[PDB]
Design a protein around this nucleic acid. Structure first.
Length: 894
DNA sequence: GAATGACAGCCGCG
DNA sequence: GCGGCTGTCATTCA
């Protein structure tokens, strides 16, 4: 196999690398890497090297990396650009591995681990690591085993060994229900004391040092803990054995040289794009697997004594959940994939600046071009996306259209790049350009409304670099589109397979099956066809990953581009992009309004009701009324109608218009393409209103079709309203949705009935479902002797009413800083001395105050403030009454 | 970023 | 008091 790297570090004048060699065994080597950098030279000096601007550069090969850095400092001290890749690990990686790297994930040691630390006095700070580590479950992907380290004796308890038979049993039998698919993979190791345990762990770690270290929150707790604990008990010298190169750096995040840490909690917050209200392994675990972490009774701090059997099983299942999630989401793989693509240390996968730099670097390197020295830049804010102010109201029929990959496309269309800047032009006001009344900026260069002018005669580095990715995206998606076709020509080729013992043919499922190997296949045994589709899958699976990676770079490029720490950052350019986009969305709004006014005979009617960055929402009321609502059989009939109107009437007008704008700004290439996204309206023959907007980023639509796919039942698309906020009490968060559903699909009368009913039934709801949820920060900065200080928030003042109601109690759950807290208003004259009273979330109020809380809680204020207030918000905008007998005059200002 | 809403707290008011 | 506002927090949505 072709060698590939595992980790790379720069220690002094040496590069330390862990890699898989020719035979496939893990190795480490120290290399006195000699980097090259470049300085500008005169035209005379012949040379193959040039900077992105064409100017000639001379290669300077150094004796070692320190001289390289030293030189970069003198160049700065003089005032002359020091060109070249300053991050030598990157250069070293680009040098040692210049060829697409094909990696064997079965040879990379990927470790997931979690520890347990019985602490009776509050969360155990990793920096103190003041308590014993009573358990460690460390799963190793290479051995595919769960190595468990159980501490038997601790200042907090001596316990029996953990039982595996018991762990295997069911809940009802007293077992811990550890899945049978890992039950034989566990390796238990109990110890007499923490020292014997840590030293054995430290040893195990040396015999199986991780390459990829993951787990839930390992970078913020597990690692810093184990590190500090070992450091405090044995020497710091010993705690360093945790690094294969014996080196560590304390940022409290311990960085271990020679290891890549992809905290799974961060890999989730990155590549899942599913903003969740909580990031606890339990919450996220239920979400992805419909099963959470093991359940136990009492407080964790007392679980090791009370039930050490469940304690150890809990630690094993915790590590196992993460593995399951990743078995689904595949993020570690995605990370490996992307890291080797750009030739960077896997952890850099988290950095777009770092990722793109390395990609553009290796590309320009292949052309003997040298990259610019990254200059320092003031962080200066510039304009961003355009968002229209919607007229608050109900909207019966709406169709939205989305510009595809807007920002990367604008980069390509205008050809925006640092080295393709060609000048500027007098900038007229942005509206003038939106209406084509401003003077054509230039008929020589490709322009942008902010005043920049780019060359059209050359391919900018950024544009070229982003286009390859777009192409590769298309390419791979192409491959795995065939892995599909070829999927059926093998899936049904097994429903009626002859009985001829043979072997699976040799075809490239990336490319559609030919006839020579299309029917020659639908006549093989059964032992082959079932393998025929094993290759069809693996292939397809491969496609998805590359295609997903490509999509992630494309969408992150602008991120890097707008960042002042990016090598190609340029305020002028960052602004060319966003302003251009700003013009695009409004110009096309102008066209859509014009086209629809003509094909409707109306005059100056505002069809586009809303736009946000790359989206426009068009009202279709008129288009529907042209055909007369009555002439439609069912709901599905008009949904079909609008779909066609869009595809054969609107989209062509759109392209035609965008096509005009391209010529107007003299752009290198027309890449502004729109897609019809949603189609919403109320159920035909119903009193439903279909949709409404209360303001920017705040709306709800009853959608029937999204990008072509027709739903069985309409799906509510709600953006920004309280139903989407986690601070809203469960019961309310679901009644508000029911209110919106009744409004869009059923109408005012339906809504009013639910409302009345909900009020009538509010007090019968469980006090936790109707409690607000909030996170407490600066909980101390606002209290003075247990009381609310100056500018003290509502949830925080609340916490202090809880504190001054349980002060002097250790069996009562404490409100820590950061974590979420339920909040509730109390009637005046309550024993707690204040308006609100919070307490930790996910828990029930301590029974020592509970009965009085359930008593004094101000249902009225609660209802009004969390339910009625926000609904009134929705109903006002939708011109609806959630209560019969309401006055029309209320909607007027004085 | 471009934006929104819950709340605190300081006006200006016979 | 309370509309008008300004600043602090808490949470979403491109």
């Amino acid at each position: 196999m072709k060698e590939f790297y595992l980790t790379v570090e720069q220690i002094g004048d040496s590069i330390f690398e862990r890699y898989i060699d020719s035979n496939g065994r893990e190795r480490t080597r120290e290399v006195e890497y000699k980097p090259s950098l470049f300085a500008h030279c005169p035209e005379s000096q012949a040379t193959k090297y040039f900077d992105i601007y064409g100017k000639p550069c001379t290669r300077k090969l150094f004796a070692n990396m320190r001289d390289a850095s030293q030189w970069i400092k003198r160049m700065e001290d003089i005032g002359l650009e020091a060109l070249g890749m300053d991050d030598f690990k990157l250069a070293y990686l680009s040098d040692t591995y210049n060829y697409e790297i094909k990696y064997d994930h079965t040879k990379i040691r990927v470790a997931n681990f979690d520890i347990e630390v019985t602490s009776p006095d509050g969360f155990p700070e990793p920096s103190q690591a003041k308590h014993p580590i009573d358990a460690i479950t460390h799963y190793d992907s290479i051995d595919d085993r769960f190595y468990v380290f159980d501490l038997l004796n601790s200042p907090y308890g001596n316990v029996e060994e953990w039982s595996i038979e018991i762990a295997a049993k069911l809940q009802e039998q007293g077992g811990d229900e550890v899945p049978s698919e890992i039950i034989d993979k566990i390796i238990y190791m109990p110890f007499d004391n923490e020292k014997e345990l840590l030293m054995e762990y430290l040893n195990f770690w040396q015999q199986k040092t991780p390459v990829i270290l993951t787990g839930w929150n390992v970078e913020s707790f597990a690692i810093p803990y184990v590190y500090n604990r070992i450091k405090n008990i044995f020497g710091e010298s010993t705690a360093k054995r945790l690094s294969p190169h014996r080196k560590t750096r304390v940022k409290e995040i311990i960085t271990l040289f020679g290891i890549s840490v992809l905290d799974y909690i961060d890999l989730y917050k990155k590549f899942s794009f599913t903003n969740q209200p909580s990031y606890s392994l339990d919450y996220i675990s239920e979400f992805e697997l419909n099963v959470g972490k093991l359940k136990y009774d009492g407080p964790i701090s007392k679980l090791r004594e009370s039930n050490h059997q469940r304690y150890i099983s809990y630690n094993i299942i915790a590590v196992y959940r993460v593995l399951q999630i990743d078995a689904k989401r595949q993020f570690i793989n995605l990370s490996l994939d992307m890291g080797y693509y750009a030739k960077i240390q896997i952890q850099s996968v988290f950095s777009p600046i770092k990722t793109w730099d390395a990609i553009i670097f290796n590309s320009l390197k292949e052309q003997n071009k040298v990259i610019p020295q990254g200059r320092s830049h003031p962080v200066q804010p510039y304009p961003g996306a355009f968002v229209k102010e919607p007229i608050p109201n109900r909207y019966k029929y709406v169709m939205s259209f989305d510009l595809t990959s807007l920002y990367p496309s604008i980069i390509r269309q205008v050809n925006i790049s640092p080295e393709t800047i060609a000048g500027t032009f007098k900038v007229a006001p942005l509206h003038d350009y939106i209406n084509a009344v401003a003077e054509r900026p230039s008929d020589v260069y490709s322009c942008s409304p902010n005043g920049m002018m780019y060359y059209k005669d050359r391919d900018g580095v950024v544009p070229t670099e982003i286009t390859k990715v777009f192409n590769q995206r298309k390419e791979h998606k192409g491959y795995m589109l065939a892995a599909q076709r070829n999927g059926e020509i093998i899936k049904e080729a097994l429903h009626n397979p002859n009985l001829s013992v043979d072997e699976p043919l040799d075809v490239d499922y990336r490319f559609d099956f030919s006839d020579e190997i299309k029917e020659k296949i639908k006549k093989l045994s059964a032992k082959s066809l079932n393998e025929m589709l094993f290759r069809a899958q693996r292939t397809e699976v491969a496609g998805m990953t590359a295609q997903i990676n490509r999509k992630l770079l494309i969408n992150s490029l602008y991120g890097a581009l707008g960042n002042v720490w990016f090598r190609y950052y340029d305020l002028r350019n960052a602004t060319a992009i966003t302003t251009f986009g700003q013009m695009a969305l409004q110009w096309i709004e102008r066209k859509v309004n014009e086209y629809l006014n003509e094909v409707c005979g109306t005059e100056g009617e505002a069809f586009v009701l809303y736009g946000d960055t790359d989206s426009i929402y068009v009202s279709a009321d008129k288009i529907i009324d042209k055909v007369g609502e009555s002439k439609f059989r069912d709901t599905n009939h008009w949904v079909d109608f609008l779909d066609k109107f869009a595809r054969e009437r609107m989209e062509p007008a759109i392209d035609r218009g965008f096509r005009e704008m391209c010529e107007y700004m003299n752009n290198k290439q027309h890449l502004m393409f729109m897609d019809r996204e949603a189609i919403a309206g109320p159920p035909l023959g119903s009193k439903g209103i279909g949709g409404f907007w209360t303001g920017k980023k705040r709306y709800a639509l009853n959608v029937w079709d999204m990008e072509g796919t027709r739903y069985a039942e309409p799906k509510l698309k709600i953006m920004g309203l309280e139903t989407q906020k986690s601070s809203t009490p469960k019961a309310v968060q679901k009644a508000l949705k029911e209110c919106i559903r009744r409004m869009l699909q059923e109408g005012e009368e339906s809504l009013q009935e639910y409302f009345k009913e909900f009020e009538k039934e509010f007090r019968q709801l469980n006090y936790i479902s109707i409690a607000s949820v909030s996170s407490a920060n600066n909980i101390a900065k606002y209290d003075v002797g247990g009381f609310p200080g100056p500018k003290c928030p509502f949830h925080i003042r609340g916490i202090l009413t809880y504190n001054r109601a349980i002060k002097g109690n250790i069996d009562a759950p404490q409100v820590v800083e950061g974590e979420k807290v339920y909040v509730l208003p109390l009637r005046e004259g309550n024993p707690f001395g204040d308006k609100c009273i919070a307490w930790p979330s996910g828990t029930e109020i301590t029974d020592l105050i509970k009965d009085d809380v359930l008593h004094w809680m101000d249902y009225t204020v609660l209802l009004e403030k969390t339910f009625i207030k926000p609904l009134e918000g929705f109903t006002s905008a939708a011109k609806l009454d959630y209560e019969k007998k309401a006055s029309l005059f209320d909607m007027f200002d004085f």
